[PDB]
mmCIF file of C-alpha atoms and ligand atoms in Angstrom:
data_model
loop_
_atom_site.group_PDB
_atom_site.id
_atom_site.type_symbol
_atom_site.label_atom_id
_atom_site.label_comp_id
_atom_site.label_asym_id
_atom_site.label_seq_id
_atom_site.Cartn_x
_atom_site.Cartn_y
_atom_site.Cartn_z
ATOM 1 C CA UNK I 14 -0.687 14.631 12.840
ATOM 2 C CA UNK I 15 -0.856 12.426 9.748
ATOM 3 C CA UNK I 16 2.564 11.626 8.345
ATOM 4 C CA UNK I 17 2.910 13.087 4.891
ATOM 5 C CA UNK I 18 5.485 11.434 2.087
ATOM 6 C CA UNK I 19 7.054 13.500 -0.310
ATOM 7 C CA UNK I 20 8.097 12.941 -3.086
ATOM 8 C CA UNK I 21 10.613 14.340 -5.539
ATOM 9 C CA UNK I 22 10.733 14.824 -8.076
ATOM 10 C CA UNK I 23 7.188 14.988 -9.522
ATOM 11 C CA UNK I 24 8.801 13.437 -13.338
ATOM 12 C CA UNK I 25 11.990 12.266 -13.868
ATOM 13 C CA UNK I 26 12.779 11.968 -18.139
ATOM 14 C CA UNK I 27 15.825 9.479 -18.574
ATOM 15 C CA UNK I 28 17.560 7.494 -21.411
ATOM 16 C CA UNK I 29 17.644 3.544 -21.237
ATOM 17 C CA UNK I 30 21.142 3.092 -19.493
ATOM 18 C CA UNK I 31 21.213 6.246 -17.338
ATOM 19 C CA UNK I 32 21.328 5.997 -13.616
ATOM 20 C CA UNK I 33 17.877 7.243 -11.796
ATOM 21 C CA UNK I 34 17.792 8.630 -8.054
ATOM 22 C CA UNK I 35 14.210 8.939 -6.384
ATOM 23 C CA UNK I 36 13.974 11.337 -2.876
ATOM 24 C CA UNK I 37 11.327 10.413 -0.360
ATOM 25 C CA UNK I 38 11.233 12.617 2.821
ATOM 26 C CA UNK I 39 8.887 12.066 5.632
ATOM 27 C CA UNK I 40 6.879 14.815 7.805
ATOM 28 C CA UNK I 41 8.616 12.524 10.901
ATOM 29 C CA UNK I 42 10.962 9.664 11.991
ATOM 30 C CA UNK I 43 9.737 6.612 10.518
ATOM 31 C CA UNK I 44 11.663 4.676 13.020
ATOM 32 C CA UNK I 45 9.700 2.525 15.363
ATOM 33 C CA UNK I 46 9.857 1.441 18.268
ATOM 34 C CA UNK I 47 10.407 -2.319 18.000
ATOM 35 C CA UNK I 48 13.616 -1.325 15.379
ATOM 36 C CA UNK I 49 11.972 -1.168 12.359
ATOM 37 C CA UNK I 50 11.683 1.353 10.033
ATOM 38 C CA UNK I 51 8.353 0.955 8.022
ATOM 39 C CA UNK I 52 9.344 2.433 4.284
ATOM 40 C CA UNK I 53 8.235 0.697 0.850
ATOM 41 C CA UNK I 54 8.909 1.425 -2.217
ATOM 42 C CA UNK I 55 6.082 0.450 -5.347
ATOM 43 C CA UNK I 56 6.265 0.469 -8.636
ATOM 44 C CA UNK I 57 3.166 1.206 -11.217
ATOM 45 C CA UNK I 58 3.236 0.365 -14.790
ATOM 46 C CA UNK I 59 0.752 2.111 -16.499
ATOM 47 C CA UNK I 60 -2.473 1.045 -16.365
ATOM 48 C CA UNK I 61 -1.456 -1.874 -14.035
ATOM 49 C CA UNK I 62 -2.077 -2.062 -10.034
ATOM 50 C CA UNK I 63 1.110 -1.138 -7.674
ATOM 51 C CA UNK I 64 3.734 -3.662 -6.853
ATOM 52 C CA UNK I 65 6.084 -3.511 -3.856
ATOM 53 C CA UNK I 66 9.819 -3.121 -4.807
ATOM 54 C CA UNK I 67 11.387 -2.432 -1.774
ATOM 55 C CA UNK I 68 10.252 -2.960 2.043
ATOM 56 C CA UNK I 69 11.640 -1.800 4.768
ATOM 57 C CA UNK I 70 13.911 1.142 3.479
ATOM 58 C CA UNK I 71 16.699 -1.876 1.839
ATOM 59 C CA UNK I 72 14.830 -5.354 1.803
ATOM 60 C CA UNK I 73 14.483 -5.988 -1.995
ATOM 61 C CA UNK I 74 11.612 -8.071 -2.878
ATOM 62 C CA UNK I 75 12.762 -10.955 -4.250
ATOM 63 C CA UNK I 76 12.984 -11.278 -8.072
ATOM 64 C CA UNK I 77 13.409 -7.543 -7.609
ATOM 65 C CA UNK I 78 16.738 -6.588 -10.117
ATOM 66 C CA UNK I 79 19.742 -6.192 -8.141
ATOM 67 C CA UNK I 80 19.859 -2.961 -10.185
ATOM 68 C CA UNK I 81 17.231 -1.836 -7.510
ATOM 69 C CA UNK I 82 18.408 0.199 -4.348
ATOM 70 C CA UNK I 83 16.352 1.631 -1.569
ATOM 71 C CA UNK I 84 18.147 3.421 1.460
ATOM 72 C CA UNK I 85 18.096 6.683 3.997
ATOM 73 C CA UNK I 86 17.192 6.473 7.044
ATOM 74 C CA UNK I 87 14.761 8.726 10.003
ATOM 75 C CA UNK I 88 12.830 10.920 7.532
ATOM 76 C CA UNK I 89 15.066 11.016 4.581
ATOM 77 C CA UNK I 90 14.839 7.838 1.951
ATOM 78 C CA UNK I 91 16.573 7.451 -1.827
ATOM 79 C CA UNK I 92 15.542 4.666 -4.069
ATOM 80 C CA UNK I 93 18.159 4.014 -7.207
ATOM 81 C CA UNK I 94 17.646 2.556 -9.995
ATOM 82 C CA UNK I 95 21.260 1.150 -11.936
ATOM 83 C CA UNK I 96 21.156 1.230 -15.879
ATOM 84 C CA UNK I 97 17.357 2.024 -16.432
ATOM 85 C CA UNK I 98 15.182 -0.698 -19.284
ATOM 86 C CA UNK I 99 11.535 0.175 -20.431
ATOM 87 C CA UNK I 100 10.216 -2.484 -17.704
ATOM 88 C CA UNK I 101 11.698 -0.514 -15.582
ATOM 89 C CA UNK I 102 8.832 2.658 -16.597
ATOM 90 C CA UNK I 103 6.338 3.669 -14.556
ATOM 91 C CA UNK I 104 4.945 5.672 -10.922
ATOM 92 C CA UNK I 105 7.502 5.218 -7.846
ATOM 93 C CA UNK I 106 5.424 5.542 -4.976
ATOM 94 C CA UNK I 107 6.853 5.452 -1.328
ATOM 95 C CA UNK I 108 5.007 4.869 1.927
ATOM 96 C CA UNK I 109 5.192 4.708 5.632
ATOM 97 C CA UNK I 110 3.850 1.990 7.463
ATOM 98 C CA UNK I 111 5.154 3.056 10.961
ATOM 99 C CA UNK I 112 1.877 4.865 11.926
ATOM 100 C CA UNK I 113 -1.855 4.844 11.512
ATOM 101 C CA UNK I 114 -2.641 5.890 9.511
ATOM 102 C CA UNK I 115 -0.367 4.657 6.637
ATOM 103 C CA UNK I 116 0.314 7.165 3.977
ATOM 104 C CA UNK I 117 1.814 7.655 0.626
ATOM 105 C CA UNK I 118 4.247 9.768 -1.327
ATOM 106 C CA UNK I 119 2.448 11.210 -4.009
ATOM 107 C CA UNK I 120 4.817 9.527 -6.972
ATOM 108 C CA UNK I 121 7.445 10.078 -9.466
ATOM 109 C CA UNK I 122 6.880 9.349 -12.797
ATOM 110 C CA UNK I 123 9.975 7.543 -14.413
ATOM 111 C CA UNK I 124 9.606 8.080 -18.203
ATOM 112 C CA UNK I 149 5.041 -16.671 -8.151
ATOM 113 C CA UNK I 150 5.693 -14.785 -5.042
ATOM 114 C CA UNK I 151 5.749 -18.082 -3.540
ATOM 115 C CA UNK I 152 1.773 -18.431 -4.994
ATOM 116 C CA UNK I 153 0.340 -15.581 -2.739
ATOM 117 C CA UNK I 154 -3.064 -14.586 -4.292
ATOM 118 C CA UNK I 155 -5.133 -11.864 -2.370
ATOM 119 C CA UNK I 156 -8.577 -11.719 -4.988
ATOM 120 C CA UNK I 157 -10.917 -8.683 -4.841
ATOM 121 C CA UNK I 158 -14.513 -8.642 -5.605
ATOM 122 C CA UNK I 159 -17.827 -6.312 -5.744
ATOM 123 C CA UNK I 160 -16.493 -3.297 -6.564
ATOM 124 C CA UNK I 161 -19.397 -1.325 -9.614
ATOM 125 C CA UNK I 162 -21.216 1.420 -10.123
ATOM 126 C CA UNK I 163 -23.459 2.600 -7.741
ATOM 127 C CA UNK I 164 -25.161 6.131 -6.686
ATOM 128 C CA UNK I 165 -24.491 8.595 -3.812
ATOM 129 C CA UNK I 166 -25.815 7.602 -0.455
ATOM 130 C CA UNK I 167 -25.552 3.648 -1.792
ATOM 131 C CA UNK I 168 -24.170 0.512 -0.387
ATOM 132 C CA UNK I 169 -21.381 -1.375 -1.598
ATOM 133 C CA UNK I 170 -19.221 -4.743 -0.200
ATOM 134 C CA UNK I 171 -15.890 -5.502 -1.401
ATOM 135 C CA UNK I 172 -14.393 -9.269 -0.483
ATOM 136 C CA UNK I 173 -11.102 -9.840 -0.631
ATOM 137 C CA UNK I 174 -9.917 -14.063 -0.607
ATOM 138 C CA UNK I 175 -6.246 -14.980 0.411
ATOM 139 C CA UNK I 176 -4.462 -17.744 0.071
ATOM 140 C CA UNK I 177 -0.718 -18.533 0.316
ATOM 141 C CA UNK I 178 0.627 -16.694 3.688
ATOM 142 C CA UNK I 179 -0.094 -17.586 6.735
ATOM 143 C CA UNK I 180 -2.877 -15.252 7.151
ATOM 144 C CA UNK I 181 -2.665 -15.034 10.985
ATOM 145 C CA UNK I 182 0.304 -13.434 11.110
ATOM 146 C CA UNK I 183 -0.926 -10.255 8.557
ATOM 147 C CA UNK I 184 -2.244 -7.052 9.239
ATOM 148 C CA UNK I 185 -5.269 -6.711 6.454
ATOM 149 C CA UNK I 186 -5.791 -3.851 4.677
ATOM 150 C CA UNK I 187 -7.947 -1.754 2.037
ATOM 151 C CA UNK I 188 -5.908 1.077 -0.101
ATOM 152 C CA UNK I 189 -7.610 2.386 -3.039
ATOM 153 C CA UNK I 190 -6.185 4.726 -5.742
ATOM 154 C CA UNK I 191 -7.722 7.826 -7.299
ATOM 155 C CA UNK I 192 -6.434 10.169 -9.913
ATOM 156 C CA UNK I 193 -7.470 13.600 -7.737
ATOM 157 C CA UNK I 194 -6.123 12.117 -4.335
ATOM 158 C CA UNK I 195 -3.578 9.168 -5.234
ATOM 159 C CA UNK I 196 -3.046 6.088 -3.161
ATOM 160 C CA UNK I 197 -4.909 6.532 -0.049
ATOM 161 C CA UNK I 198 -5.263 3.519 2.770
ATOM 162 C CA UNK I 199 -8.291 3.453 4.312
ATOM 163 C CA UNK I 200 -9.116 0.732 6.628
ATOM 164 C CA UNK I 201 -7.025 -2.055 8.533
ATOM 165 C CA UNK I 202 -7.693 -5.190 11.096
ATOM 166 C CA UNK I 203 -5.134 -6.446 12.372
ATOM 167 C CA UNK I 204 -4.312 -9.956 13.798
ATOM 168 C CA UNK I 205 -4.920 -12.168 17.150
ATOM 169 C CA UNK I 206 -1.675 -10.937 18.693
ATOM 170 C CA UNK I 207 -2.194 -7.524 17.736
ATOM 171 C CA UNK I 208 -5.975 -7.740 19.656
ATOM 172 C CA UNK I 209 -7.502 -7.843 16.163
ATOM 173 C CA UNK I 210 -7.248 -4.059 16.527
ATOM 174 C CA UNK I 211 -9.344 -2.231 13.512
ATOM 175 C CA UNK I 212 -7.819 1.398 12.642
ATOM 176 C CA UNK I 213 -9.844 3.784 9.538
ATOM 177 C CA UNK I 214 -8.928 6.911 7.942
ATOM 178 C CA UNK I 215 -10.906 10.194 8.916
ATOM 179 C CA UNK I 216 -12.014 10.123 4.960
ATOM 180 C CA UNK I 217 -14.168 6.524 5.689
ATOM 181 C CA UNK I 218 -14.419 6.558 9.591
ATOM 182 C CA UNK I 219 -18.396 6.271 10.538
ATOM 183 C CA UNK I 220 -18.478 4.870 7.029
ATOM 184 C CA UNK I 221 -16.859 1.921 6.815
ATOM 185 C CA UNK I 222 -16.306 -0.895 8.429
ATOM 186 C CA UNK I 223 -13.419 -3.350 7.932
ATOM 187 C CA UNK I 224 -14.225 -6.927 8.535
ATOM 188 C CA UNK I 225 -12.076 -10.177 8.927
ATOM 189 C CA UNK I 226 -12.153 -13.901 8.796
ATOM 190 C CA UNK I 227 -9.298 -16.033 9.587
ATOM 191 C CA UNK I 228 -11.098 -19.208 8.787
ATOM 192 C CA UNK I 229 -11.439 -18.588 5.697
ATOM 193 C CA UNK I 230 -8.249 -15.858 5.035
ATOM 194 C CA UNK I 231 -10.560 -13.107 3.905
ATOM 195 C CA UNK I 232 -10.793 -9.386 4.648
ATOM 196 C CA UNK I 233 -14.183 -7.578 3.330
ATOM 197 C CA UNK I 234 -15.105 -3.681 3.985
ATOM 198 C CA UNK I 235 -18.350 -2.730 4.062
ATOM 199 C CA UNK I 236 -19.035 0.770 2.353
ATOM 200 C CA UNK I 237 -22.052 2.586 3.327
ATOM 201 C CA UNK I 238 -23.412 6.176 2.525
ATOM 202 C CA UNK I 239 -20.929 5.931 -0.611
ATOM 203 C CA UNK I 240 -19.894 9.317 -2.382
ATOM 204 C CA UNK I 241 -18.369 10.356 -6.133
ATOM 205 C CA UNK I 242 -15.101 11.472 -3.716
ATOM 206 C CA UNK I 243 -14.813 7.334 -3.030
ATOM 207 C CA UNK I 244 -15.125 6.487 -6.723
ATOM 208 C CA UNK I 245 -11.217 4.817 -7.096
ATOM 209 C CA UNK I 246 -9.564 1.237 -6.885
ATOM 210 C CA UNK I 247 -9.683 -0.158 -4.130
ATOM 211 C CA UNK I 248 -7.150 -2.947 -3.285
ATOM 212 C CA UNK I 249 -6.576 -5.277 -0.190
ATOM 213 C CA UNK I 250 -3.159 -5.937 0.826
ATOM 214 C CA UNK I 251 -1.383 -8.370 4.035
ATOM 215 C CA UNK I 252 1.457 -6.884 5.678
ATOM 216 C CA UNK I 253 3.610 -9.626 7.233
ATOM 217 C CA UNK I 254 6.914 -7.809 9.353
ATOM 218 C CA UNK I 255 7.316 -4.719 7.092
ATOM 219 C CA UNK I 256 6.525 -6.732 3.791
ATOM 220 C CA UNK I 257 2.757 -6.486 1.727
ATOM 221 C CA UNK I 258 1.452 -7.711 -0.735
ATOM 222 C CA UNK I 259 -1.535 -6.421 -2.787
ATOM 223 C CA UNK I 260 -4.385 -7.378 -5.037
ATOM 224 C CA UNK I 261 -5.026 -6.256 -8.728
ATOM 225 C CA UNK I 262 -7.596 -3.743 -7.148
ATOM 226 C CA UNK I 263 -11.746 -3.879 -7.896
ATOM 227 C CA UNK I 264 -13.380 -0.579 -8.819
ATOM 228 C CA UNK I 265 -15.432 1.487 -7.632
ATOM 229 C CA UNK I 266 -17.557 4.047 -9.408
ATOM 230 C CA UNK I 267 -19.847 6.826 -7.395
ATOM 231 C CA UNK I 268 -21.861 8.479 -9.281
HETATM 232 O O1 FLU W 301 6.140 -6.260 11.870
HETATM 233 C C1 FLU W 301 5.737 -6.822 12.216
HETATM 234 O O2 FLU W 301 6.854 -6.839 13.734
HETATM 235 C C2 FLU W 301 4.505 -6.901 12.559
HETATM 236 C C3 FLU W 301 4.536 -8.462 13.022
HETATM 237 C C4 FLU W 301 3.338 -9.192 11.914
HETATM 238 C C5 FLU W 301 1.992 -8.373 11.530
HETATM 239 C C6 FLU W 301 2.448 -7.196 11.427
HETATM 240 C C7 FLU W 301 3.218 -6.382 11.874
HETATM 241 C C8 FLU W 301 3.673 -5.350 11.590
HETATM 242 C C9 FLU W 301 3.668 -4.218 12.899
HETATM 243 C C10 FLU W 301 3.371 -4.731 14.310
HETATM 244 C C11 FLU W 301 3.325 -3.853 15.221
HETATM 245 C C12 FLU W 301 3.621 -2.671 15.059
HETATM 246 O O3 FLU W 301 3.885 -1.522 16.117
HETATM 247 C C13 FLU W 301 3.127 -2.047 13.841
HETATM 248 C C14 FLU W 301 4.026 -2.296 13.015
HETATM 249 O O4 FLU W 301 3.315 -2.383 11.702
HETATM 250 C C15 FLU W 301 3.937 -2.459 10.573
HETATM 251 C C16 FLU W 301 3.961 -2.289 9.407
HETATM 252 C C17 FLU W 301 3.970 -3.002 7.966
HETATM 253 O O5 FLU W 301 4.036 -2.161 6.642
HETATM 254 C C18 FLU W 301 3.467 -4.208 7.941
HETATM 255 C C19 FLU W 301 3.891 -5.320 9.129
HETATM 256 C C20 FLU W 301 3.850 -4.218 10.431
#
């Protein structure tokens, strides 16, 4: 039932100045009943956090050069990069947010912002069985019009969406990944423009960098992440 996002190729070697093309396919249509197709492309530079380059298939995040273009429809999507430069090098991910759970492709290795801020705190080291509360304080966007999420990253599983807390128009509904159901609880406070993640009964496999994200009208902003180690 979970939408599988498949990227090709896993690794894409290029020479500076060449054109690059990355494919992302979904296991089912990403066309939403509301008319939007919720497909994002991200770039993660080595050692840094993922940043959105393209949203709703083809919309370029302002600031991203015109050399980048997203295209496609339904289940078949493509990111094109003209005249590759050094700053473009890193891992590109696609993600779908039409269906819950939100899901990510496995990545392809190619080898401010209106004052928006999201700051994650609470990370650290705990032993299995332990608990930890992550907090995310935001500013620079009208929080009431955003769905807040927690997404995590590990070498073993890649990017994984784990929880969502919708806004008032969408009944403040919460959703969780099966991997954390019954253990993690996402909470939201509009007055403080903050979201929190209470993580109980932690396991080694919960180890990862945890990012808070704010999504609205197909766009998404992400924090720099906070590291959680369960050892
Ligand atoms: O896209 C929207 O209409 C919308 C507006 C405000 C807040 C969230 C959404 C939004 C969705 C609203 C309804 C729905 O059925 C699905 C939505 O999906 C989204 C996916 C995103 O990445 C990012 C945003 C959304």
